[PDB]
Amino acid sequence: DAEFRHDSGYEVHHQKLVFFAEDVGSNKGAIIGLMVGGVV
Amino acid sequence: DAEFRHDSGYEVHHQKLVFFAEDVGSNKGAIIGLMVGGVV
Amino acid sequence: DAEFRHDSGYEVHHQKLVFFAEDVGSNKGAIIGLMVGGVV
Amino acid sequence: DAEFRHDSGYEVHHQKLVFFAEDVGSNKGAIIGLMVGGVV
Amino acid sequence: DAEFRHDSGYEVHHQKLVFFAEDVGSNKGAIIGLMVGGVV
Amino acid sequence: DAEFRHDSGYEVHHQKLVFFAEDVGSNKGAIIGLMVGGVV
Amino acid sequence: DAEFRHDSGYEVHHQKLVFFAEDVGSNKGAIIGLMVGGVV
Amino acid sequence: DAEFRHDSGYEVHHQKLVFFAEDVGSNKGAIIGLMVGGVV
Amino acid sequence: DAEFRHDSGYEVHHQKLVFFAEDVGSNKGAIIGLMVGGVV
Amino acid sequence: DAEFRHDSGYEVHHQKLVFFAEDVGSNKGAIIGLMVGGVV
Amino acid sequence: DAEFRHDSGYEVHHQKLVFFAEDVGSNKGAIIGLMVGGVV
Amino acid sequence: DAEFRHDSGYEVHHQKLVFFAEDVGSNKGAIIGLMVGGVV
Amino acid sequence: DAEFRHDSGYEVHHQKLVFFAEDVGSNKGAIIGLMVGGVV
Amino acid sequence: DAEFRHDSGYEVHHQKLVFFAEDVGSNKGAIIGLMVGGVV
Amino acid sequence: DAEFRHDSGYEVHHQKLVFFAEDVGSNKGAIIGLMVGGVV
Amino acid sequence: DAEFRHDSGYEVHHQKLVFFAEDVGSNKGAIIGLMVGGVV
Amino acid sequence: DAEFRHDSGYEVHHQKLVFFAEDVGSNKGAIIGLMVGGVV
Amino acid sequence: DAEFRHDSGYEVHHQKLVFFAEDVGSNKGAIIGLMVGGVV
Amino acid sequence: DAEFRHDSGYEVHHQKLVFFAEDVGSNKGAIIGLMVGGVV
Amino acid sequence: DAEFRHDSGYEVHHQKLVFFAEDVGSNKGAIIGLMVGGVV
Amino acid sequence: DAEFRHDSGYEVHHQKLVFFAEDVGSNKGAIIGLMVGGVV
Amino acid sequence: DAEFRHDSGYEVHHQKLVFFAEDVGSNKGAIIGLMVGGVV
Amino acid sequence: DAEFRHDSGYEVHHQKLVFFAEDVGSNKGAIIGLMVGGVV
Amino acid sequence: DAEFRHDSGYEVHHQKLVFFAEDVGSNKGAIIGLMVGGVV
Amino acid sequence: DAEFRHDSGYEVHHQKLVFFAEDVGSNKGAIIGLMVGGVV
Amino acid sequence: DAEFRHDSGYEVHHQKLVFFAEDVGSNKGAIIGLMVGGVV
Amino acid sequence: DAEFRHDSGYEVHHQKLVFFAEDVGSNKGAIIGLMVGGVV
Amino acid sequence: DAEFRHDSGYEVHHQKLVFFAEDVGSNKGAIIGLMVGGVV
Amino acid sequence: DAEFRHDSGYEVHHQKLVFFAEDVGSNKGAIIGLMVGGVV
Amino acid sequence: DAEFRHDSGYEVHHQKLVFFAEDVGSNKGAIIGLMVGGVV
Amino acid sequence: DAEFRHDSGYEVHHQKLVFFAEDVGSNKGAIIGLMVGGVV
Amino acid sequence: DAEFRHDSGYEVHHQKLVFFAEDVGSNKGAIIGLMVGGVV
Amino acid sequence: DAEFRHDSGYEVHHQKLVFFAEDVGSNKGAIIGLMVGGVV
Amino acid sequence: DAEFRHDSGYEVHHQKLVFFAEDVGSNKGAIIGLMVGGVV
Amino acid sequence: DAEFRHDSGYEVHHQKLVFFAEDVGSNKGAIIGLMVGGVV
Amino acid sequence: DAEFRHDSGYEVHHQKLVFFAEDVGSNKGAIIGLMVGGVV
Amino acid sequence: DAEFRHDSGYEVHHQKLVFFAEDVGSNKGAIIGLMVGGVV
Amino acid sequence: DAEFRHDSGYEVHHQKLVFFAEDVGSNKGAIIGLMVGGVV
Amino acid sequence: DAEFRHDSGYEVHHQKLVFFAEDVGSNKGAIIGLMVGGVV
Amino acid sequence: DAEFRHDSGYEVHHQKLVFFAEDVGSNKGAIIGLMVGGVV
């Protein structure tokens, strides 16, 4: 995207498991079926 | 998006499990079927 | 969106489980079926 | 995207497991089915 | 993309496992089915 | 891409395993099915 | 691409293993099926 | 590419193993199926 | 390519093993199926 | 290529093993299937 | 190619083993299947 | 090639073994299947 | 080729073994299957 | 070739073994299958 | 070739063994299968 | 060839053994299978 | 050939052995299978 | 040949053994299978 | 040949052994299988 | 031959042994199988 | 869908223009945020 | 859906324009926010 | 989809223009955010 | 899909233009963000 | 896909133009972000 | 795919132009970001 | 693929032009970022 | 592939031009970034 | 591949031009970044 | 390949031009960056 | 390859021109960057 | 290769020109950068 | 190769010209940069 | 090679010209840069 | 080679010209840079 | 070689010209740069 | 060689001209640069 | 050589001219630069 | 040599000219630059 | 030599001219530059 992202960690006293999945999905811009510049 | 995101952690005294799934879904912009610039 | 988001953690004394799913769903912008610039 | 990203670590006292999957999905720009510059 | 990225490490007191996967997916630019410069 | 990337390491008190895989997927530029400069 | 990359190491107190795989995938420029300069 | 790259090492107190693989994949330039300068 | 590359070493207190493989893959320039200067 | 390369060593306190394999793969220039200067 | 290369050594306190293999692969110039200067 | 190459040694305190192989592979110039100066 | 090469030695405190094999491979100029100056 | 070469030695405190093999491979000029000055 | 070569020695404190083999391979000029000055 | 060569010695404190084998290989000029001045 | 050669000796403090085998190989000029001044 | 050669000696403090063999090989001029001045 | 040769000696402090073998090999001029001044 | 040759001695301090074998080999002029001044 | 579709044309006495766009929209199956097979 | 669709044309005596956009909208199946198989 | 489609043409007495765009939109199967086989 | 498609043409009395674009859009199978076989 | 396709032509009394683009879009199988066989 | 395709032509009374492009887009099989056989 | 293809021609009364481009796009099999057989 | 292909011609009354390009694109098998047989 | 191909011609009443290019693109087998048989 | 190929001609009433280019592109078999039989 | 090929001609009533270029491209077997039988 | 080839001619009523080139390109077997039997 | 080849001619009513060039290119066997039987 | 070859002629009613050039290119066996039977 | 060859002629009604060139290229056996039977 | 060859003639009704050139090229056996039976 | 050869003539109704040149080229056995029976 | 040869004549109705040249070139046995029975 | 040769004549109805030149070239046995039975 | 030779004549009807030149060339045995039975 036209902007950024961020993340942060820091400590813990025991075991830690982390799973991260960002932005699942097709589109982030524009989807166009058909465009016509001009007819007659 | 034209804006950013953020996250934060910090500590804990025992085991921690974390699962993250951001922005599930197709679109973040525009979907359009068809456009006509001008007819007759 | 044109606005950001945030999250926070902090500690606990025992095991903690977290599951997060943000913005489930297709659209965040505009959906258009058909547009006509002008006829006759 | 026209913007960057970031990440952060820092220490912990025991074992840590991390799994990261950035931007899963087809499109980040524009998809066009068919475009016509002009007809008659 | 038109912008860069970043990452960060730092130490820990015990074993750490890290798995990283950036930008899984087909497109980061523009996909065009067919384009016509002009007809009659 | 038209921009660079970065990474960072630093020490740790015990064993560390790291696996890195950037930019999985076909396209980073433009894919065009067919283009016509002009017809009649 | 039109831009460079970077990496960083630094020390550690015990054994470290690193595996690096950069830019897996076919395309980094332009792929064209067929282009026509002009017809009639 | 049209830009350079970089890497960095530095020391360590115990054994280190490194495996590196840059730019796996077919294309870094342009692939054209068929191009026509002009027809009739 | 139209630009250079770089690498760096430096010392270590114990044994180090390094394996390096740069730019694995067929193409770094242009591939053309067939090209026509002009027809009729 | 149209640009140069570089490498660096420096000392170490114990045994070091290095294996280097640059630019694996067929092409670094242009591959043409068939080209026609002109037809009728 | 149209540009040179470089390498560097320097000392070490214990044994060192080095294996080097530059530019494995067929082509560094141009490969043409068939070219036609002109037909009718 | 149309440019030169270089290498460097320097001392060491214990034994050193070096194996060096330059430009393994068939081509450094141009390979042509067949060329036609002109037909009818 | 149209350019020269270089190498360098310098001393060492213990035994050194060196093996050098430059430019292994068939071609360094031009290979042509068949050429026709002109037909009809 | 159309250019020259070079090498360098210098001293050493213990035994040294060197093996040198320059320009392995058949061709350094031009190989032609068959050439025709002109037909009809 | 159309250019000369060079070599250099200099002293050493202990024994040295040297083996040198230059330009192994058939051709340094031009190889032609068959040439025709002109046909009909 | 159309250019000369060179070599250099200089002293040494202990025994030295040298073996020199220049230009192993058949051809330094031109090899022609069959040449035709003209046919009909 | 059309050019000369050179060599150099100079002293040494202990025994030295030298072996010199210059230009091993059949051809230094031109080899022709068959040449025809002209046919019909 | 069409050019001369050279060699150089100079003294030595201990025994020296030299073996020299110049231009081993059949041809230094032109070898032709057969020639035809003209046919019909 | 059409040019001369040269050699050089000078003194020595201890025993010296020299063996010289110049231009071993059959041909130094031209060898012709058969030649025809003209046929019909 | 068409040119001369040369050699040099000079004083020596201890025993010296020299062996010279100049231009061993069959041909120094021209060898022809058969010549025909003209046929029919 | 688990069912097919259909279309029909037939004639007209003058010019006819038709534009068709089937099934505008993201989904035809199922979109779900998250599932849990079982907890404690 | 589990049902098919249909369309029909037939003729008219003058110009006719038709624009058709079927099933505009995201969902045709089922959308689920979160589902739990069972807790305690 | 698990079912097929169809289309039909037939004749007309004058010019006809037809534009067709089937199934614009991301999904025809299943999209899953995250699934868990079982926890504790 | 698990089913086929179809199309039909047939003749007309004057010029006809047809443009066809089937199945524009990313997905036709299954997209999964992350799946877990089992945890504790 | 697991099924085939079809097309049909047939004649027409005047000029006809046809443009066909089948299955534009990234995916036709399955895309998985990350899958885990089992954890603890 | 696991199934074949088809096409059909047949005649026409005047000129016909046809342009055909099949299966535009990256994937026809399976794309996986990262897979884990099992952890602890 | 695991299945074949087909095409058909047949005659026409006037000129016909055909352009065919099948299966444009990177993948027809499987693409994997990283796979792990098993960890601890 | 694991299956064959086909094509068909047949006659025509006037000139015909055909251009055919099969299977443009990188992959027809499997592309793998990195695989691990097993770790600890 | 593991299967064959085919083609067909047949006659025509006037001139015909044909241009054919099969399987343009890098890969028909397997491309692997790196493989590990086993670690610890 | 592991299967054969085929082609067919047959007659024609007027001139015919044919150009054929099979299997353009680098690879038919297997390309491997680096393989490891086993580590510790 | 492990299989053969074929071709066919047959007659024609007027002039015919044919140009054939089989299997343009580097590889038909296996290309290995570097392989290791085993380490420690 | 491990299999043979074939070709066929047959007659024709007027002039025919044929130009044929098989297997243009470097490799038909195996190319290996470097192989190691075993290390420690 | 490990198999044979074949060709065929047969008659023609007017003039015929044929040009044949089989297996143009460097390698038909195995090319190895460097091989090691075993190290320590 | 380990196999033979073949060719065939047969008659013709008018003039015929044939040119044959088999197996252009350097290698038909094995090329090795350097081989080591064993080290320490 | 380790196998024989063959050729065939037969008659013709008018003039015939034949030019034949077998196996142009340096190597039909083994070319080795350097071999080492064993080191320490 | 380790096998024989063959040729065939037979009659003809008008003039015939034949030119035959077998095995042009340097090597039919083995070429070795330098071989060592054993070192220390 | 270790095998024989053959040739054949037979009659002809008009004039015939034949030119034969067998095995042009330097080597039919083994060429060795330098061999060592054993060192220390 | 270690094997014999053969030739054949037979009659002819009109004039015949034959020119024959066997085994042009230097070597039919073994050529050795320098050989050493043993050193220290 | 170690084997014999052969030839054959037979009659002829008109004039016949024959020219025979066997084994032009220097060597049929062994050529050695210099050989050493043993050193120290 | 160690074997004999042979030739054959037989009757002729008209004038016949024969020219024979057997085994032209320097060597039929062994040529040695210099041989040493033993040193020190």
Residue numbers in the entry:
A (entry chain d), B (entry chain c), C (entry chain 6), D (entry chain e), E (entry chain 5), F (entry chain V), ...: 1 to 40
From the study:
Particularly, Aβ40 fibrils exhibit considerable variability in protomer conformation and consequent fibril morphology, likely due to the lack of C-terminal stabilizing interactions compared to Aβ42 fibrils.
In this study, we report the discovery of a novel J-shaped protomer structure of Aβ40 fibrils, resolved at 3.3 Å resolution using cryo-electron microscopy. A 3D density map unveiled a left-handed cross-β structure formed by two protofibrils, which we had previously confirmed via AFM. Notably, the cross-sectional view (top view) depicted discernible electron density spanning from D1 to V40. Specifically, in the J-shaped structure, the N-terminal D1–H13 segment folds back against the extended portion of the same protomer. The intra-protomer interaction of the J-shaped fibril is characterized by the formation of salt bridges between D1 and K28, as well as between R5 and E22; meanwhile, in the I-shaped structure, the N-terminal D1–V12 segment lacks order, contributing minimally to the density. Moreover, a unique interaction emerges between the S26-OH group at the center of each segment in our J-shaped fibril. Unlike the well-documented C-, I-, or U-shaped structures, this J-shaped conformation highlights an extensive intra-protomer interaction network facilitated by salt bridges formed at D1–R5, D1–K28, R5–E22, and D23–K28.
